[PDB]
């Protein structure tokens, strides 16, 4: 398979701020995978963030991201966003929009395709 991903967004958020990311999808894939961001903390290992399925039926959240993270895919241009609610000040990381070429995410460790990173610092 070979999938090209178009991730955009970022900027300079402040403690308590929010982001509205984006990740467009193009190319052929062995399966209709699920989009999402697969982010590491600065100096930390890559970690799962939040998942949405291509059918807009499955959503996932994590404890370190609960209450301040949300994933949604656009119905028109098929660019999945990352809607935010009061992001904390410790998310000064680079968010990678990875790809999982599986219809179901039994485990998040094996990632089929990688995307572009979004380095956003959280300070005023």
């Amino acid at each position: 398979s070979a999938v090209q991903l178009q991730a955009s967004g970022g900027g300079f958020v402040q403690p308590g701020g929010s982001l509205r990311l984006s990740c467009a999808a193009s190319g052929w894939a062995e399966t209709f995978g699920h989009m999402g961001w697969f982010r590491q903390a600065p100096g930390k290992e890559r970690e799962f963030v939040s998942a949405i399925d291509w059918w807009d039926t499955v959503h996932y959240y994590a404890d370190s991201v609960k209450g301040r993270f949300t994933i949604s895919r656009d119905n028109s241009k098929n660019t999945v966003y990352l809607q935010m609610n009061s992001l904390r000040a410790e998310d000064t990381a680079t968010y990678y929009c990875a790809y999982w070429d599986m219809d179901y995410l039994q485990n998040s460790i094996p990632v089929d395709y990688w995307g572009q990173g979004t380095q956003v610092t959280v300070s005023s």
Binding site: P42, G43, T94, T121
Partner: protein
């Protein structure tokens, strides 16, 4: 790597920091891998005169 910083500049010396000693003296990458050993040397690096 080794160097000397102030006491008020301890918070100023970190990855992603800003200031006349962070952006202008030594910058650490966001995904930096390693360590920082910070100890005081008042009896050696400081002169009473």
């Amino acid at each position: 790597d080794s160097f000397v910083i102030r006491g008020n500049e301890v918070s100023q010396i970190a990855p992603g920091q800003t200031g006349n000693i962070a952006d202008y003296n030594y910058k650490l990458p966001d995904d930096f891998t390693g360590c920082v050993i910070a100890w005081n040397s008042n009896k050696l690096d400081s002169k009473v005169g």
